[PDB]
Symmetry: C3
Subunit: 118 residues, 3 copies
């Protein structure tokens, strides 16, 4: 899985261990091994949510499967929780785009995750 | 709705009021309330369009519904117009990816829109 | 087509000619004219792959058509090869999300690539 967070919160406000915490928590939530989880945090961004520049975050979570109604609600509770406690961003100022990726559309290690057909 | 603009134009060339103009015009164009519109502008990027480093922009607009043939042509005229007037980027050096999001695939406020 | 590379490798490590090499090689691989290929390289990013901060890259390739099983494996071999040779990133620390875009969902030049029906 791949999780990206873009926020106007300053870099100094990102706590040590944050990328590791996201990796570990996402591994647990998705059931995927941590070795396969990638995380990218982008602070100091020029952005607004509802016309306001108060702290906010625009994010995305891509995963091959493990994406759906109930799971996404659960992912959001988890992620909004972490953004609120770690970056002090209010949950109602957080957007998370979820993408259910097809294995053939995810490249890795010189190939893709579609290794069964030619 | 969520709108992102990545450009090689320098930050100093982004005019005061740009994020607000984007927010209000997108609210108008999509019919969505402005308090739910999010905008992200990323200047000073290392990018090329057609192999050239002249000003350009790579964007995306995500919306739950309100995405389609005519509407997207409408959004593109509006957005290219703004990028041309405000950031001096030629419309033919602008790409905008449109995404019609399913409500269950958009997280917000500890839950999703489903 | 549009190709984005986000990486924790420093800017200084991006070699002169990289954006042009990506443009030319992607034109070749997708069969699309180079004039329509857009590339964006984002170095010095705060990111982790598998919990580690060793060099890695999270990428995306968007194209109207020319996206599929065999083609994506070919794009991955090409792109991981370039990232390994030019940015010294291990192919197993690279993820590339492929997006087959519908022409009506790609804006350009005040309109979209859907010019047939209105
Ligand atoms: C085999 C499927 O499981 C995995 O490890 C995955 C890797 C992965 C990489 C990139 C990505 O954008 C989305 C992803 O989702 C996954 O489930
Ligand atoms: C007002 C109802 O719809 C909304 O609020 C929306 C929010 C939203 C968030 C994130 C996103 O990627 C795309 C979105 O599109 C919308 O229509
Ligand atoms: C005319 C030949 O093809 C094109 O123009 C294309 C442009 C394009 C723009 C943005 C994008 O995200 C993906 C794209 O894929 C294409 O094939």
């Amino acid at each position: 899985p791949m999780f990206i967070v873009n926020t106007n919160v300053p870099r100094a406000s990102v706590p040590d261990g944050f990328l590791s915490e996201l990796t570990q928590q996402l591994a647990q939530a998705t059931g995927k091994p941590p070795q396969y989880i990638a995380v990218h945090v982008v602070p100091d961004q020029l952005m607004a949510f509802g016309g306001s520049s108060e702290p906010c975050a625009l994010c995305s979570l891509h995963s091959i499967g493990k994406i759906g109604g109930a799971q996404n609600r659960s992912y959001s509770k988890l992620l909004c929780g972490l953004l609120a406690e770690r970056l002090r961003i209010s949950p109602d100022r957080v957007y998370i785009n979820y993408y259910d990726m097809n294995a053939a559309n995810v490249g890795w290690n010189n190939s893709t995750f579609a290794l069964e057909h030619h």
